[PDB]
Amino acid sequence: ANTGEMKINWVSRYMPLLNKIAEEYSREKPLSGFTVGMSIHLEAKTAYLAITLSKLGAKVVITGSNPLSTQDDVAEALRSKGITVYARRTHDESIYRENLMKVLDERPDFIIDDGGDLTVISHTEREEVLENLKGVSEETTTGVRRLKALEETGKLRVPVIAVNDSKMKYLFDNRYGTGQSTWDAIMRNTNLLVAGKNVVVAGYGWCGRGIALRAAGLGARVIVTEVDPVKAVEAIMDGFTVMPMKEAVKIADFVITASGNTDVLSKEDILSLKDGAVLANAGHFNVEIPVRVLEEIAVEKFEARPNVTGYTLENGKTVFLLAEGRLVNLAAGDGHPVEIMDLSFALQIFAVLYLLENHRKMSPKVYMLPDEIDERVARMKLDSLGVKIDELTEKQRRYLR
Amino acid sequence: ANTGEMKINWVSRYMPLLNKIAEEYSREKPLSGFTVGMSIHLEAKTAYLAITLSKLGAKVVITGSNPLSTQDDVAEALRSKGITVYARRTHDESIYRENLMKVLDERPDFIIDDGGDLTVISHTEREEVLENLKGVSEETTTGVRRLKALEETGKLRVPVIAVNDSKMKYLFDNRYGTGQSTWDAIMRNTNLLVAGKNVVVAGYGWCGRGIALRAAGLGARVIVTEVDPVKAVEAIMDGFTVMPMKEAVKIADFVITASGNTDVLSKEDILSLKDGAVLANAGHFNVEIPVRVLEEIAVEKFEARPNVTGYTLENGKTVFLLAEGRLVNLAAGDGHPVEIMDLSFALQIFAVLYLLENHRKMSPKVYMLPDEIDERVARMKLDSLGVKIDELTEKQRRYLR
Amino acid sequence: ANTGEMKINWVSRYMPLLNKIAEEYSREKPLSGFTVGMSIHLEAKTAYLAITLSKLGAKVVITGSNPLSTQDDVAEALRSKGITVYARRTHDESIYRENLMKVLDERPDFIIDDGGDLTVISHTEREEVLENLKGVSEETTTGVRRLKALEETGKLRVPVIAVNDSKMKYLFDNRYGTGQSTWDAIMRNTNLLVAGKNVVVAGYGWCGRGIALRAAGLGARVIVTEVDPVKAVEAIMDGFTVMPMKEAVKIADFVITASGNTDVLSKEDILSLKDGAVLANAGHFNVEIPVRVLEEIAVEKFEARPNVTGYTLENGKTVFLLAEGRLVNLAAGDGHPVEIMDLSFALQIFAVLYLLENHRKMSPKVYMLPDEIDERVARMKLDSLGVKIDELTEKQRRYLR
Amino acid sequence: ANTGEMKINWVSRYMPLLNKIAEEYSREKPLSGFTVGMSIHLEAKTAYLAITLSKLGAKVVITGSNPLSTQDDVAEALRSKGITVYARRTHDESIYRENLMKVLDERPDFIIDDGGDLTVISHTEREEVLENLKGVSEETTTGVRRLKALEETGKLRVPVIAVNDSKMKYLFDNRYGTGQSTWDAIMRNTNLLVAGKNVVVAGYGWCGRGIALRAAGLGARVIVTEVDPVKAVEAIMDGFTVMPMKEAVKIADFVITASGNTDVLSKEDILSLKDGAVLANAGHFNVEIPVRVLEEIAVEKFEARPNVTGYTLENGKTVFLLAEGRLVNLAAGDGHPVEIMDLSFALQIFAVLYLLENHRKMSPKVYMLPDEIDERVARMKLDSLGVKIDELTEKQRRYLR
Ligand SMILES: NC(=O)C1=CN([C@@H]2O[C@H](COP(=O)(O)OP(=O)(O)OC[C@H]3O[C@@H](n4cnc5c(N)ncnc54)[C@H](O)[C@@H]3O)[C@@H](O)[C@H]2O)C=CC1
Ligand SMILES: NC(=O)C1=CN([C@@H]2O[C@H](COP(=O)(O)OP(=O)(O)OC[C@H]3O[C@@H](n4cnc5c(N)ncnc54)[C@H](O)[C@@H]3O)[C@@H](O)[C@H]2O)C=CC1
Ligand SMILES: NC(=O)C1=CN([C@@H]2O[C@H](COP(=O)(O)OP(=O)(O)OC[C@H]3O[C@@H](n4cnc5c(N)ncnc54)[C@H](O)[C@@H]3O)[C@@H](O)[C@H]2O)C=CC1
Ligand SMILES: NC(=O)C1=CN([C@@H]2O[C@H](COP(=O)(O)OP(=O)(O)OC[C@H]3O[C@@H](n4cnc5c(N)ncnc54)[C@H](O)[C@@H]3O)[C@@H](O)[C@H]2O)C=CC1
């Protein structure tokens, strides 16, 4: 309450956008009477999202998506601000859906949820809320995948706004954010030098490039592994070396998966890995780096550092795995940078305020964030940054037509 | 003939893809009987395109998009290889359309043309050819704009393939190509230092970024001007400074337009320009930098260097303009790098070989290059580069589904 | 003991050089009978230095240069390996010199000390040890400053080797090390975004450039402030913007002192600092950023984050200070990267083994590390990195002469 | 005269420093009566050096160090400004020393010469001038090598100032200058793509790093070959890959020597070079890349492009050599960038004005440029660039002491 108060005060002074949203809507309180339910990693940052939603006059009901990572002192700071928060260090799967169930026990008008776990529970086990439910906002990718399977099978009966697709998210979340946060998680938990070390990045998309770029930034010799030749050729042009994972693994000092795939490393590769090879996953679930395969194949297994688990193999070489193969920057770092998140939230807060406005006009279909929002957030960010860009004149506006 | 022969031998050893296309189709000669007509900047590189088309068994009939000489040693080298080439020797367009007319006087099956000047002449003044004409390939942007105005007004009656849109073009043409070639044109014609000088780049798209990137590569302090906030915000994130052209112009050492616009500089800005400011256009026509406005406003006007024209203004300050405000890397450099062009051509050679195959199956509509070609060219490039990437397995291919 | 054991096991697998020194001298035990005394920041890394010295057969007697930062569990792990370690969370100034006194109470042959606090205590209060004392190694800068004041006043009567000057230290310590460790300390303690933020670096020497470089690496727009025009001119050429601290301070998001000076910021500048400006010192003592001046001028003062202290000023703007103005990467991070340290140690280990060899041959004077050591460590590093460089042939060796 | 006039007008507007030296000494004409003799590559830039010296009131007597590169229209423009210039497309070795002889036939007070060819001719064949001769300025390296062999054998009897050693030259000449000018020479003469190509830089000193840096700048994957492990280790840390020339040569697209050595490539390596490998020398004489060895070993030899000579080897692979193995940016480019040269000149103009002042005070010894000049030029450059740096205060000036 007094610590979780500070963890939020710190975050608060660096969420420029949300503060702007909170002084251009705070008075008009457009979300009064309306109650927003949400399932999301609970910590200082996501909490400021809830707090500014509340500042807009909404009744926020949160669930601790992260049972393990629930920061007690923060959840308590939220309650003392009039925000229903159902979170427990449950650890047991059973208790999660139960909390999910309790937010629905509040029949919300709008829902900003995780992986569609909340909106899907409604459409298949609790239609009560399904009626009062006016709109849904989905940031994840798993979720959007799910809330689309519904739309295609006509089972979906509420408008959804996927904010995972907008050049502003891909830029700040996927590129700059996961880029900085991934390397920060890696060096705060290992204190290894990055300069003059071979870093292998598996996958060269938004995240791959970001991680790669930042790595080059730290002085690393970057090697990129790819499956899509078009990306592989771009990596070359970017001054990097491209090779098969089978061949790269033999020289890597760090290996980072950033592909939305599985088993990016085979028993083979892992056995080629040189001694002291640190592996991290900055992509999907915990399947990019074969954790199961490591566990079995391991002769020994031990905790070396707070977030580093080491595995000694038959070859006598021992490999380290950050955050147990889970999303390294989130489960070992601070997630994304405070302002990076500020923007990823600002987008969601507008996705909600959009659902509220063009409420009815919308039909039970999953919509991609409206391009008008990106333009808005960008202008707001430039504005808080003290940057002013040129405005298109009529001679030109005409010319372009 | 003996010089133009070498200018082609040089290019020839660095067109990896076209040589691959010429030894995997050279024997099978799939373009026999077929005659390809084309309007394109005539020089060593574009000539190797014609030569490899001919290697495939085609009768190539070329027109000199660009005003050449009667004995231009390259044109003569092509003739001595059995390639009808109608080169223009004037500035006035009277003679240009005339040559355009003579390629049609050969009634071609396929056409790789410039700005649609060739395919549009057919549909509106020469329907004879319009029947034998089986397909058209359009690389430009003005052209595709034009050959679309037709399709929309149903006046188009032949399938068209726009190769201007494919991530491979945007990458190699727009980014790395114009990026390198633009700075090369600028420093071979001025020999000024780039390090520690303020470079202003107007526009931050594919070309903007590339030029920007490369400039930073040369040591310049880059300033970006933009109209689209989403791009402007990305420029900040990339470590650059963003300001209005009005404000940047006061400190620029070089100014480079890369926006598809006009009058990126007003009389105002030009008079703010410091003395010795070199301006170049790497974008559209010769209207990005107001050449007309410079000519009028100028107190003096003189040729300083082979491609630099200087204008002394009322303020006593004199500004320089590269390539008369025209596309600087093309009219002052060598166009794009040899292999950059090799790829931009390889794409077109396949666009033609596609029109030939899926010939009839296609209906008088403008099609975007088939994604299967990009994938192919990339694989071919990686292969000549000696790079091998990972192949997707079944566990994963299944997983992704 | 079981935690401090791991904190050392971790470090141990990433100290390539020291392990090499520990298997090319481990058997020969050249430091038997000899006891090494040392005053140094006590933690996992410096401990492995002591451990490998002991592996060489020396009796190591350590003092906790850092009273406050003494990691009990690590000190205890050292003791359980036969290493006298006098460290206490003393906090009281009095107890520091007392432990310094107890290592002398062991009359050492060689001394690797901190700021000359140990060798100066001998020459001015305890000449007993001054006789058995055979050699001294000085890594600091303050120390070497001091142990030179002695040599010049003939008060010094023992050979000293200053390892602070060698291109290998300046490279790994001053450049890459402090460069990475500084940004790591700053982002693990604030989780702020670095991309698209103005970073101001005061001073452009080894450390300035490194910090600058890395900052650029993270996406920041870098501004450099300098007093030596030669450096300032180099910063421009490197693509950065240079201005007076008075002017830069008005736009900085981070300010980092890296000059070996004091009051790099005046009451003035601090009052120009924008709200939320984070300040960090990566240079000398805690005087670069005027901490005293902040404390007085402050209307409020509060702890915001574990290593961030915030000061609200009369202007209502509040500024933050990392690690209380002390060396930010050391007192808020992990000091330098593990391998960076491995090399900074390897150099000292040889400085000792040099004092042992060319023991007598040397006269009571302060010597700069012998260039022969740099060459050795570099070759050892290249070797552990798996890098092989060309060997000069006779045609060339002769040619160069 | 009217062309050579413009080639000089162009250069003139981008020699900020020399213009400043020409309006802070132009009135005072401190070099009246005094005649300056000099042997230097004659072209627009070096000519502006002569012209500003003349502006200071000196009688300039120039020789065309470059017999082949003498730009007639420029030499004639100098004469029409009252400057004795002995230059001829001699081509014949005999005629060079003859012109050298004619500048001495003018008995100069000061000499800015090339490789000591002028000052050494005096001390060994023409002592007449040796008496009136008051001072000598040496910029080269060969020269300084020579004029030192004299000093050591007491044969030297006139004060010499070596401007080749000053951090300002190493910076602008060796680093940024040769760095930009080298890549410009290479891409204006080949138009090959640099991005995504392997660039091998032999030698990692001031020149090596610059070339390397810039190459990375253009998107190349850089490979560095070195003999000094300290540099090799720095290259790794800089994000590059280091290997033996024998191994790098097999994958290079460009090879650039920047070591002050010979036969950086053996018959062996040359035969490993892949087809189309372009080689350039940016270092010493024409012996870094074994031109003689190429000539012999070659099965064919032909001119491919104005500055590219190609050699087809027994293995059927043909390699290209820029500028015949000579300093590539000078003999194939424009030498260094205009302002880079402006600074390298400004330094020499002060070295002369220093010889004039502290004329007698100096004894027949070779002196390294006085650090007071570096400081001066840097301040002058910062000033023309519109940059203002902080001034050290008393609290600090005292502190530092
Ligand atoms: N760390 C974080 O906080 C964040 C993580 N992500 C995750 O990062 C992953 C990738 O993000 P994006 O780059 O935007 O996806 P993307 O589609 O833009 O890039 C994916 C690339 O991975 C490559 N790839 C697939 N399998 C591979 C394999 N076995 N080896 C090497 N390369 C392979 C593909 O060819 C593709 O180009 C996603 O799973 C996403 O959920 C997304 C946002 C933030
Ligand atoms: N030099 C060459 O060889 C090549 C030239 N181009 C030309 O470059 C131009 C742009 O190409 P791209 O960048 O890839 O398209 P793009 O759409 O990605 O770049 C356009 C950018 O310019 C900005 N912009 C428009 N007007 C502006 C103004 N008045 N001031 C500042 N910014 C402005 C837009 O907001 C946008 O971000 C086109 O005209 C194209 O034809 C394209 C390929 C190669
Ligand atoms: N944080 C760490 O772990 C490390 C810290 N250091 C410390 O960093 C400091 C600098 O190290 P170096 O850069 O190698 O010395 P340096 O001499 O190479 O750099 C110092 C620079 O500060 C500039 N400077 C002085 N006063 C200034 C002012 N008022 N404003 C702006 N610039 C100013 C000087 O012109 C000089 O170039 C030293 O005090 C050193 O002990 C050194 C190594 C590691
Ligand atoms: N192109 C131009 O206009 C200019 C050329 N130079 C020339 O560049 C050359 C080097 O300049 P710096 O870098 O300042 O000298 P440097 O000493 O700073 O760097 C030269 C490096 O070459 C390396 N080296 C020597 N032999 C080698 C071999 N066989 N293989 C691989 N590496 C080897 C050495 O370890 C040395 O560090 C000199 O000969 C100089 O005259 C200098 C300035 C301008």
Tab-separated table of C-alpha atoms in Angstrom, chain C residues 232-391:
chain	number	residue	atom	x	y	z
C	232	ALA	CA	34.178	18.105	-29.037
C	233	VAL	CA	35.157	18.205	-32.700
C	234	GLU	CA	35.467	14.392	-32.738
C	235	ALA	CA	31.951	14.086	-31.258
C	236	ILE	CA	30.529	16.138	-34.128
C	237	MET	CA	32.327	13.965	-36.650
C	238	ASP	CA	30.874	10.929	-34.883
C	239	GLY	CA	27.412	12.198	-35.776
C	240	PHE	CA	26.542	13.785	-32.439
C	241	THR	CA	25.489	17.315	-31.454
C	242	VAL	CA	27.712	19.357	-29.165
C	243	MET	CA	26.615	22.270	-26.998
C	244	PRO	CA	27.247	23.898	-23.635
C	245	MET	CA	25.958	22.044	-20.595
C	246	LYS	CA	23.892	25.169	-19.918
C	247	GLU	CA	22.023	24.657	-23.185
C	248	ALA	CA	21.926	20.849	-23.288
C	249	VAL	CA	20.514	20.518	-19.809
C	250	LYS	CA	17.295	22.166	-21.029
C	251	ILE	CA	16.440	19.205	-23.240
C	252	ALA	CA	18.121	16.180	-21.643
C	253	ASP	CA	16.189	13.094	-20.584
C	254	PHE	CA	19.298	11.603	-19.008
C	255	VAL	CA	22.483	13.408	-18.104
C	256	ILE	CA	25.602	11.390	-17.481
C	257	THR	CA	28.828	12.844	-16.186
C	258	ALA	CA	31.960	11.092	-17.393
C	259	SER	CA	34.480	13.869	-16.936
C	260	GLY	CA	37.091	13.594	-14.239
C	261	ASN	CA	35.775	16.883	-12.845
C	262	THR	CA	33.413	18.545	-10.344
C	263	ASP	CA	30.206	20.533	-10.483
C	264	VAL	CA	29.611	19.627	-14.099
C	265	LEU	CA	26.190	21.102	-13.303
C	266	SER	CA	25.570	24.463	-11.627
C	267	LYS	CA	22.559	25.550	-9.564
C	268	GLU	CA	21.659	27.214	-12.850
C	269	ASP	CA	21.663	24.137	-15.049
C	270	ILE	CA	19.873	22.023	-12.463
C	271	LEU	CA	17.098	24.635	-12.520
C	272	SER	CA	16.939	24.399	-16.318
C	273	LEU	CA	16.646	20.601	-16.216
C	274	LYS	CA	13.222	19.494	-17.416
C	275	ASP	CA	10.915	17.572	-15.106
C	276	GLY	CA	11.821	13.885	-14.830
C	277	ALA	CA	15.447	14.332	-15.849
C	278	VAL	CA	17.458	11.399	-14.536
C	279	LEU	CA	21.046	12.146	-13.625
C	280	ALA	CA	23.885	9.673	-13.250
C	281	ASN	CA	27.599	9.857	-12.596
C	282	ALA	CA	29.869	7.337	-14.265
C	283	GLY	CA	33.072	9.197	-13.508
C	284	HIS	CA	35.052	10.306	-10.466
C	285	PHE	CA	33.841	10.630	-6.846
C	286	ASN	CA	30.314	11.862	-6.080
C	287	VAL	CA	31.130	15.441	-7.026
C	288	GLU	CA	30.546	15.500	-10.773
C	289	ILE	CA	26.843	16.013	-10.257
C	290	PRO	CA	26.568	18.505	-7.338
C	291	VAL	CA	24.735	16.289	-4.856
C	292	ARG	CA	25.223	18.801	-2.052
C	293	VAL	CA	23.730	21.537	-4.240
C	294	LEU	CA	20.713	19.326	-5.006
C	295	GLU	CA	20.124	18.527	-1.332
C	296	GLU	CA	20.090	22.246	-0.336
C	297	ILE	CA	18.199	23.618	-3.328
C	298	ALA	CA	15.566	20.904	-2.877
C	299	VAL	CA	12.055	21.737	-1.670
C	300	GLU	CA	11.403	18.015	-1.236
C	301	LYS	CA	13.641	14.948	-1.309
C	302	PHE	CA	12.409	11.381	-1.435
C	303	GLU	CA	13.321	7.812	-2.344
C	304	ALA	CA	11.414	6.819	-5.474
C	305	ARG	CA	13.090	3.562	-6.474
C	306	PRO	CA	15.695	1.368	-4.728
C	307	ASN	CA	18.487	3.434	-6.290
C	308	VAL	CA	16.662	6.546	-7.373
C	309	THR	CA	16.382	9.581	-5.113
C	310	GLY	CA	14.090	12.366	-6.366
C	311	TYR	CA	14.443	16.096	-5.721
C	312	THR	CA	11.549	18.525	-6.315
C	313	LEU	CA	12.807	22.066	-6.944
C	314	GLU	CA	11.337	25.550	-6.411
C	315	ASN	CA	10.208	25.500	-10.053
C	316	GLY	CA	7.941	22.588	-9.200
C	317	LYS	CA	10.043	20.358	-11.429
C	318	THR	CA	11.468	17.195	-9.834
C	319	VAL	CA	14.767	15.610	-10.872
C	320	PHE	CA	16.053	12.118	-10.051
C	321	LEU	CA	19.526	11.042	-9.070
C	322	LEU	CA	20.833	7.486	-9.488
C	323	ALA	CA	23.092	5.926	-6.853
C	324	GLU	CA	23.236	9.227	-4.952
C	325	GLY	CA	25.658	10.733	-7.451
C	326	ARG	CA	28.191	7.958	-6.922
C	327	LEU	CA	29.705	5.813	-9.697
C	328	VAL	CA	26.365	4.570	-11.082
C	329	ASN	CA	27.395	1.236	-12.593
C	330	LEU	CA	29.235	0.145	-9.459
C	331	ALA	CA	26.840	1.307	-6.761
C	332	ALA	CA	23.644	0.548	-8.704
C	333	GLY	CA	24.715	-2.123	-11.142
C	334	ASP	CA	27.085	-5.092	-10.987
C	335	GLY	CA	30.211	-3.057	-11.621
C	336	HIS	CA	31.726	-4.075	-14.934
C	337	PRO	CA	30.679	-7.144	-16.982
C	338	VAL	CA	32.102	-10.441	-15.756
C	339	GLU	CA	34.587	-10.939	-18.623
C	340	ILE	CA	35.456	-7.235	-18.625
C	341	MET	CA	36.547	-7.754	-15.068
C	342	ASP	CA	38.249	-11.038	-15.899
C	343	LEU	CA	40.601	-9.072	-18.132
C	344	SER	CA	41.077	-6.193	-15.706
C	345	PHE	CA	42.071	-8.867	-13.147
C	346	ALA	CA	44.228	-10.980	-15.457
C	347	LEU	CA	46.256	-7.792	-15.993
C	348	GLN	CA	46.771	-7.381	-12.257
C	349	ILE	CA	47.564	-11.058	-11.696
C	350	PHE	CA	50.425	-10.659	-14.196
C	351	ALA	CA	51.448	-7.350	-12.657
C	352	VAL	CA	51.995	-9.360	-9.467
C	353	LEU	CA	53.767	-12.267	-11.189
C	354	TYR	CA	55.954	-9.585	-12.806
C	355	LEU	CA	56.796	-7.991	-9.476
C	356	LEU	CA	57.712	-11.490	-8.292
C	357	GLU	CA	60.004	-12.193	-11.236
C	358	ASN	CA	61.732	-8.873	-11.959
C	359	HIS	CA	61.490	-8.368	-8.195
C	360	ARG	CA	64.882	-6.963	-7.166
C	361	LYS	CA	65.863	-5.734	-10.627
C	362	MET	CA	63.293	-2.974	-9.999
C	363	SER	CA	63.974	0.226	-8.057
C	364	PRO	CA	61.485	2.063	-5.725
C	365	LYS	CA	59.720	3.800	-8.607
C	366	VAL	CA	56.181	3.612	-10.045
C	367	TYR	CA	56.244	1.721	-13.366
C	368	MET	CA	53.588	1.672	-16.078
C	369	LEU	CA	52.353	-1.816	-16.913
C	370	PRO	CA	54.902	-3.451	-19.237
C	371	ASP	CA	53.644	-3.444	-22.826
C	372	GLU	CA	54.579	-7.131	-22.921
C	373	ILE	CA	51.609	-7.915	-20.646
C	374	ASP	CA	49.031	-6.201	-22.879
C	375	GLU	CA	50.264	-8.234	-25.839
C	376	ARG	CA	49.976	-11.375	-23.712
C	377	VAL	CA	46.455	-10.814	-22.397
C	378	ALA	CA	45.228	-9.874	-25.863
C	379	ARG	CA	46.643	-13.093	-27.334
C	380	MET	CA	45.097	-15.059	-24.440
C	381	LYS	CA	41.715	-13.420	-25.033
C	382	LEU	CA	41.830	-13.988	-28.795
C	383	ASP	CA	42.716	-17.569	-28.016
C	384	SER	CA	39.784	-18.211	-25.672
C	385	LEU	CA	37.548	-16.464	-28.205
C	386	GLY	CA	38.666	-18.875	-30.908
C	387	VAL	CA	40.191	-16.144	-33.014
C	388	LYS	CA	43.444	-16.542	-34.927
C	389	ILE	CA	45.196	-13.554	-36.500
C	390	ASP	CA	47.965	-13.355	-39.086
C	391	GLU	CA	51.603	-13.747	-38.072
